[PDB]
Design a protein around this ligand. Structure first.
Ligand SMILES: *[C@@H]1O[C@H](CO)[C@@H](O[C@@H]2O[C@H](CO)[C@@H](O[C@@H]3O[C@H](CO)[C@@H](O)[C@H](O[C@H]4O[C@H](CO)[C@@H](O)[C@H](O)[C@@H]4O)[C@@H]3O)[C@H](O)[C@H]2NC(C)=O)[C@H](O)[C@H]1NC(C)=O
Ligand SMILES: *[C@@H]1O[C@H](CO)[C@@H](O[C@@H]2O[C@H](CO)[C@@H](O[C@@H]3O[C@H](CO)[C@@H](O)[C@H](O[C@H]4O[C@H](CO)[C@@H](O)[C@H](O)[C@@H]4O)[C@@H]3O)[C@H](O)[C@H]2NC(C)=O)[C@H](O)[C@H]1NC(C)=O
Ligand SMILES: *[C@@H]1O[C@H](CO)[C@@H](O[C@@H]2O[C@H](CO)[C@@H](O)[C@H](O)[C@H]2NC(C)=O)[C@H](O)[C@H]1NC(C)=O
Ligand SMILES: *[C@@H]1O[C@H](CO)[C@@H](O[C@@H]2O[C@H](CO)[C@@H](O)[C@H](O)[C@H]2NC(C)=O)[C@H](O)[C@H]1NC(C)=O
Ligand SMILES: *[C@@H]1O[C@H](CO)[C@@H](O[C@@H]2O[C@H](CO)[C@@H](O)[C@H](O)[C@H]2NC(C)=O)[C@H](O)[C@H]1NC(C)=O
Ligand SMILES: *[C@@H]1O[C@H](CO)[C@@H](O[C@@H]2O[C@H](CO)[C@@H](O)[C@H](O)[C@H]2NC(C)=O)[C@H](O)[C@H]1NC(C)=O
Ligand SMILES: *[C@@H]1O[C@H](CO)[C@@H](O[C@@H]2O[C@H](CO)[C@@H](O)[C@H](O)[C@H]2NC(C)=O)[C@H](O)[C@H]1NC(C)=O
Ligand SMILES: *[C@@H]1O[C@H](CO)[C@@H](O[C@@H]2O[C@H](CO)[C@@H](O)[C@H](O)[C@H]2NC(C)=O)[C@H](O)[C@H]1NC(C)=O
Ligand SMILES: O=C(O)CC[C@H](NP(=O)(O)OC[C@H](NC(=O)c1ccccc1)C(=O)O)C(=O)O
Ligand SMILES: O=C(O)CC[C@H](NP(=O)(O)OC[C@H](NC(=O)c1ccccc1)C(=O)O)C(=O)O
Ligand SMILES: *[C@@H]1O[C@H](CO)[C@@H](O)[C@H](O)[C@H]1NC(C)=O
Ligand SMILES: *[C@@H]1O[C@H](CO)[C@@H](O)[C@H](O)[C@H]1NC(C)=O
Ligand SMILES: *[C@@H]1O[C@H](CO)[C@@H](O)[C@H](O)[C@H]1NC(C)=O
Ligand SMILES: *[C@@H]1O[C@H](CO)[C@@H](O)[C@H](O)[C@H]1NC(C)=O
Ligand SMILES: *[C@@H]1O[C@H](CO)[C@@H](O)[C@H](O)[C@H]1NC(C)=O
Ligand SMILES: *[C@@H]1O[C@H](CO)[C@@H](O)[C@H](O)[C@H]1NC(C)=O
Ligand SMILES: [Ca+2]
Ligand SMILES: [Ca+2]
Ligand SMILES: [Cl-]
Ligand SMILES: [Cl-]
Ligand SMILES: [Zn+2]
Ligand SMILES: [Zn+2]
Ligand SMILES: [Zn+2]
Ligand SMILES: [Zn+2]
Lengths: 692, 692
């Protein structure tokens, strides 16, 4: 029999291990020869595995690279202009890799060039509230200063945006042991901690879903008309560079000026964490100088797109996608994900060779240039947007399979909650002490839901990964799952985007038996299997009704911190609660009809109502000043691209509203966003009413 | 048997005559009690006729009305401030209507208030080229002048926009006998010509598809958040008023300054048609003064929405819609259309009572406030946009059934061309001398296609009617048909928007036997019947491929007027011609599959490909500065809302390009629009490829 159990049983830990090893022996940086060769290998193997077609889709997009003959570094410079301390030119390579070529040195992708010189200010995590504290409470002015910020808490592009708006002339990012060194664990190669010479690479764009900075709205194909650099989307205006904590200590140890305002500003180094500006007494004439010479370059990238044609509904697409490009070896990010995709394709192909086909078409994607701003997935979705919005059932992401070994993490649309619960009850837990128990049981025990007894936590989607275009731009139901750490006893994982993130890291310290990888392959592959084969799409609209109420209560509570203004400007949430009530009632009736109807037209009318329900939350006018974030219920937080925000239009209208100089205008915009949200909820509800 | 012939045979001229009489006895101005009562009558009768549901959909939108106790008028004023001549306060009412209440006096809807005083400049039709001629060739400056323009050639809102950009402080519109008095025909009530006291009402907005000026993007429902007036969409900034040619003659006869530049600037009055500014010698100290006191008022409007549920595909909608509100009696516009809709509903209902149902759902609409800017259709489409874009098969408009008695006029998407040809070959011609011949034969004979022997002329859709939101915003295949005049021996019809447009006008002078109305009911009702019942949707994608080539040749020829700039800036149309070639090849292959496949999934996949093909030409970012015109192949001309323009993004980028001060920037934008057009054509083509 060809059923889900047949698909799941064919998946093997040993295969995933073999593929991870195969994918992580050399760097696969976006736009390089090595990553094009890997794309060709994947393409050939997916054909071998049995897919109906496997093509490369290429685009020419803006990338960023250091200059090989003019290296980036930071100095402390004395009053004579002598550089008395320099940060490192590269991370010491790990054992046995000291002769590997083409390891990109640490840099911040898309930094402009410059050599700014000035006094340091320490800005903690460079979050919106950190800058509020500096400027409003401490009266410290960042204008014309170089800021030094620790990585963690929020997406690094938001840090740079915040520094730039505070008037900084450059940004130094560093990894503090407080955030990247777990107590009692050794650093790499003897443990999974970050060594003092380790450095986190990463892009610092603020694209807001645009894709390639030069071609917002349209694929970067052969005849594309490109914006000039000065009109490009999302580039930083000040130089930026990342360093490790050995180098950070040398920059922080001399800092003077004001003391940290409280303990939440202090990391784990043996330094005062003074905010500045500048150094203490004896060193007051010394300055910090950056030397950045990286160049932005339009470069070709390649996605691999594999098709497994559906037997009954070939014009309905379930997409499993994850990226292939890495900063260096990609031991976790992304190859732990890509190896899982590879084994899933292999398993689906095994069944296909025996004569089986899924009910709906499955598309498999190996995305390029994710690390430079989700570029490969976004350009391909721009090219194919008409097909995706009329045919896209669901998108399941497949980046890093593991960031810990403690329990499952799932972030997804409410439409998938019931699917995920049901699937995990049928899978075996890989956890020690839970042998013979379900993954649902171990997950629910280790990560309880904050609101419901006997249910596990499932989070809303944020961004910072390839599902962004499908979910927040196009309104296609999306999900993701991976193994994670215990958040209570622990900021991602310490070796993230460093040369030390290797095959050996995973095989020695994360998942020696590859059983967590296998469990994640079962979850991602099982979700895809059910989405692509279930007669009735496995979405429960009633789960959306429950969360919409929770989010409406949440936004109303935020507004209710300002009761006098709500009275003065007549700010009512009545329409939003009415829409949510109507959605609840209509969804309940639709569910009854869905349970109560071989008449393939009613079924398909009803599958179309299920498929277009996520689509109904899209506003074609987009959110204010963010035209590619169109989903009215969810958008990436304007303060942290990684976090999702609910009712983002109202949330941003209320944020820091007490500091707006024209309260009538500000509260008018709150009321406008309430209207847009109530209207969109009611409109989505009405897509589930009887059609005529 | 219940087939198309049964539907068509049930339609009766005598019924249409009865309904027109019934609809035209009192004024039905949008927002008035009388028009709400008519909505309730229509609703009750459509239920009686047998529709499954018939509801009113109401909205609160910005309307405009004169002040009943402070009338609008224009004066000539002498140097002492004495008003020595005043324009009329109302049109002399027609025989037997001299005691009818609530006839709105002539006014321009949405004019601001004011009493500007100044020297006249005559600007011909106030077209873009008329202003070019004044400013560039004649060196005449309109700044601070009152302009007088004749109606005709272009939409009156474009005239006002053009006057406003030339710096005018007010606009007087008038009907010249050259454009509204056919030689050898008597004026009303003795013929169908415009009398000297007759005046054309009409709105002067520039909405660019926005709908209600206060709520662009969202329905004007009970909780809507409204823009303030100063931020409203499309309102004119200078006062505007319309007059008849008896009054115009008194204003023009004294004009001095420069002579008309040529004969194309001269109408038919016994005046010099001097351009001005100002009056000749003896009258040089006299001025013109406007007195406008109309008020914009948020007012409730009501659409009637009737549903005839489909038997097999109830989630696919074919819409027949036309407006019900009129300036006065609406003898032609719109009641000649609404009476035809009414008889069509009656006929469909007769078949339904005998047990028949169409394959797909048919929606019937009586729109309100069309005359004030397509407000009723646009608000309802904003409310229902998610349902319409995923379920909308086609929209057939149904305004004025007759504007002449010579031959058929059809404007529609290329997807309907074959449907229209085939249907008209099965209908009888109503024309004298063609008895026993088909409508196709009489139409083709009287209105030959400019490019193909033995085919009739079918025009592209412009705007200025209720199909605009469905076609140019939402990308739903749209069409319209009516009887028209001989354009060779004749500017609409003379009595348009005047008190004289009555039942008697139609019954005495246009269509005494109601046979032209009946033929138009057959065409509109037959199109709806085929769209709603044909197993395979009656769209031929190959007809789109043929026109796309014609439009690409046309736009390339415009650009080729500037060969040096094309060389300098490397402006190539190669990508657009490549996309059109690919569309042609793919459409041809799709047509073969469509001919070559009871497997209801392949059929529906293929009906969905047909339905979403018009949809594929929508760009969600819209055209430059016109976000509600999203169709990349067609938009209303930026110089004349009534006319359609093909490849409007490229057309507007090339328009008057030799007068742009930064040619590099201007030609860059031409190249951007070529890229957007080539990409959209290729993307639409690819929706017709095999789906997997
Ligand atoms: C949730 O679903 C419910 C339907 O179950 C839906 O209820 C609708 O609410 C609207 C807006 O409140 C009602 O609108 C009214 O309609 C009547 C005619 O049917 C009008 O006469 C009313 O207007 C008068 O009263 C107003 C309010 O005081 C005045 O402002 C106005 O000037 C008029 O005097 C009013 O427009 C509508 O009838 C119901 N529909 C029903 C019950 O079927 C509700 O809107 C949905 N929620 C959302 C957010 O969409
Ligand atoms: C109409 O349909 C046809 C398909 O029948 C489609 O043809 C495609 O054209 C593109 C763009 O011209 C071709 O792109 C090439 O692809 C190869 C790899 O397959 C690349 O190596 C090429 O790049 C090299 O050469 C370029 C041109 O000189 C250089 O600029 C570049 O730097 C590289 O050296 C190039 O990208 C594509 O292969 C075909 N696809 C086919 C034939 O299947 C055409 O694009 C469609 N028209 C439109 C408007 O979409
Ligand atoms: C990763 O695995 C692939 C697939 O087995 C290897 O590529 C093959 O290499 C052999 C021996 O060189 C060739 O004969 C095949 O043509 C290759 N197959 C392909 C590309 O599909 C590759 O060597 C492995 N890489 C590493 C680093 O171990
Ligand atoms: C840090 O790096 C700089 C750049 O290489 C060093 O300064 C240079 O030293 C060379 C050789 O002594 C001089 O000829 C260059 O003119 C210097 N360049 C600049 C920009 O100053 C510097 O010595 C290094 N500092 C330390 C402490 O190692
Ligand atoms: C998850 O599993 C539950 C329990 O089996 C499913 O709910 C049942 O679905 C069937 C089929 O419609 C109903 O007859 C039962 O009444 C349901 N039981 C309940 C609600 O307790 C549920 O549909 C599954 N969710 C999916 C497949 O998305
Ligand atoms: C237009 O026709 C309608 C429908 O026949 C007329 O309205 C009816 O009037 C009669 C007599 O007053 C009433 O008993 C009915 O209740 C009405 N039916 C409706 C509203 O559906 C109306 O009188 C006609 N109007 C004119 C001007 O002739
Ligand atoms: C045109 O209309 C105006 C406005 O009614 C007339 O001027 C008014 O005449 C009355 C009575 O003679 C005066 O008391 C008002 O003060 C006048 N108003 C203004 C604004 O001038 C005017 O006489 C009419 N002109 C003609 C030729 O009929
Ligand atoms: C208009 O009528 C023509 C002529 O009947 C239709 O074209 C025929 O369609 C049938 C059915 O697929 C084919 O077998 C014939 O070969 C076609 N004849 C031709 C092209 O000359 C055409 O489909 C009709 N158009 C519609 C219904 O939109
Ligand atoms: O440019 C973008 O939007 C993201 C590019 C790139 N994404 P990637 O490193 O592959 O994945 C980061 C992403 N991070 C998170 O989901 C996350 C979520 C919560 C807190 C902190 C991080 C992930 O682990 O999936 C990055 O974050 O630098
Ligand atoms: O506001 C709008 O966009 C249009 C409102 C209103 N439409 P309406 O008068 O009902 O119809 C005008 C419309 N005019 C044309 O189609 C037309 C087409 C070509 C040349 C001149 C006129 C029609 O006859 O359908 C008007 O034109 O004043
Ligand atoms: C990189 O630096 C070298 C050496 O100083 C320089 O000559 C070259 O122009 C640079 N490459 C760039 C800017 O792409
Ligand atoms: C910060 O410093 C600069 C002076 O160099 C000044 O222009 C800017 O206005 C200052 N901002 C504040 C808030 O004091
Ligand atoms: C794997 O799990 C064990 C047992 O809890 C733990 O001690 C170890 O730190 C984990 N490894 C990682 C990389 O989290
Ligand atoms: C209409 O004009 C009258 C009479 O002069 C005035 O009192 C009233 O305010 C006006 N109505 C308006 C502006 O709506
Ligand atoms: C037209 O007239 C006014 C003078 O009142 C002037 O401000 C404006 O610049 C003039 N325009 C041209 C083109 O001469
Ligand atoms: C109706 O047709 C006749 C015959 O051609 C013509 O003389 C008359 O002018 C037409 N009426 C109208 C209103 O066009
Ligand atoms: Ca792009
Ligand atoms: Ca609106
Ligand atoms: Cl993921
Ligand atoms: Cl029409
Ligand atoms: Zn990743
Ligand atoms: Zn990453
Ligand atoms: Zn009309
Ligand atoms: Zn009209």
């Amino acid at each position: 029999k060809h059923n889900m159990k047949a698909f799941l049983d064919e998946l093997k830990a040993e295969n995933i291990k073999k593929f991870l090893y195969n994918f992580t022996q050399i760097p696969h940086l976006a736009g390089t020869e090595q990553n094009f060769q890997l794309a060709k290998q994947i393409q050939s193997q997916w054909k071998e595995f049995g897919l109906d077609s496997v093509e490369l889709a290429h685009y020419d997009v803006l990338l960023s690279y250091p200059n090989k003959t003019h290296p980036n570094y930071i100095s402390i410079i004395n009053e004579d202009g002598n550089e008395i301390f320099n940060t490192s030119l590269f991370e010491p390579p790990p054992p046995g890799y000291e002769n590997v070529s083409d390891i990109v040195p640490p840099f911040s992708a898309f930094s402009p060039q410059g050599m700014p010189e000035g006094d340091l200010v320490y800005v903690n995590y460079a979050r919106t509230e950190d800058f509020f504290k500096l400027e409003r409470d401490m009266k410290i002015n960042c204008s014309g200063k170089i800021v030094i910020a620790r990585y963690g808490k929020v997406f690094r592009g938001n840090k740079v945006k915040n520094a730039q708006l505070a008037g900084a002339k450059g940004v130094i990012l560093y990894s503090d042991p407080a955030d990247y060194f777990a107590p009692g664990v050794k650093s790499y190669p003897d443990g999974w901690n970050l060594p003092g010479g380790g450095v986190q690479r990463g892009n610092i764009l603020n694209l807001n879903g645009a894709g390639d900075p030069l071609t917002p709205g349209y694929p970067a194909n052969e005849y594309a008309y490109r914006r000039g650099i000065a009109e490009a989307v999302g580039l930083p205006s000040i130089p930026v560079h990342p360093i490790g904590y050995y180098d950070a200590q040398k920059l922080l140890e001399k800092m003077g000026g004001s003391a940290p305002p409280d303990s939440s500003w202090r990391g784990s180094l043996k330094v005062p964490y003074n905010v500045g500006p500048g150094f203490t007494g004896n060193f007051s004439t010394q300055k910090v100088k950056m030397h950045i010479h990286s160049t932005n370059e339009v470069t070709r990238i390649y996605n691999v797109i594999g098709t497994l044609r559906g037997a009954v509904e070939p014009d309905r697409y379930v997409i499993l996608g994850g990226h292939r490009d890495s900063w260096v070896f990609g031991g976790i990010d992304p190859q732990s994900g890509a190896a899982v995709v590879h084994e899933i394709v292999r398993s689906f192909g095994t069944l296909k060779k025996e004569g089986w086909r899924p009910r709906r078409t499955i598309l498999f994607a190996s995305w390029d240039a994710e690390e430079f701003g989700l570029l490969g997935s976004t350009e391909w979705a721009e090219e194919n947007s008409r097909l995706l919005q009329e045919r896209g059932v669901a998108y399941i992401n497949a980046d890093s399979s593991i960031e810990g070994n403690y329990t499952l993490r799932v972030d997804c649309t409410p439409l998938m909650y019931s699917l995920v619960h049901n699937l995990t009850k049928e899978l075996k837990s890989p956890d020690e002490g839970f042998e013979g128990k379900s993954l649902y049981e171990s997950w629910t025990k280790k990560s309880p839901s904050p609101e419901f007894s006997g249910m596990p936590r499932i989070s809303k989607l944020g961004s910072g990964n390839d599902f962004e275009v499908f979910f927040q731009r196009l309104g296609i139901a999306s999900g993701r799952a991976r193994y994670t750490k215990n958040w209570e006893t622990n900021s991602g994982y310490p070796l993230y985007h460093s040369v030390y993130e290797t095959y050996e890291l995973v095989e020695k310290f994360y998942d020696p038996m590859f059983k967590y990888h296998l469990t994640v392959a079962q979850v991602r592959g099982g979700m895809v299997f059910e989405l692509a084969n279930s007669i009735v799409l496995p979405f429960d609209c009633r789960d959306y009704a429950v969360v919409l109420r929770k989010y409406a209560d949440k936004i109303y509570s935020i507004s209710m911190k300002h009761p006098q203004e709500m009275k003065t400007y007549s700010v009512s949430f009545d329409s939003l609660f009415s829409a949510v009530k109507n959605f609840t009632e209509i969804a309940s009736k639709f569910s009854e009809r869905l349970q109560d109807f071989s008449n393939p037209i009613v079924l398909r009318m009803m599958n179309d109502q299920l498929m277009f329900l996520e689509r109904a939350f899209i506003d074609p006018l987009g959110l204010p000043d963010r035209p590619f974030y169109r989903h009215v219920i969810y958008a990436p937080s304007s303060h942290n691209k990684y976090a999702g925000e609910s009712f983002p239009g109202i949330y941003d209208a209320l944020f820091d509203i007490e500091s707006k100089v024209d309260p009538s205008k500000a509260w008018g915009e709150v009321k406008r966003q309430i209207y847009v949200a109530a209207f969109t909820v009611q409109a989505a509800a009405e897509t589930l009413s009887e059609v005529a």
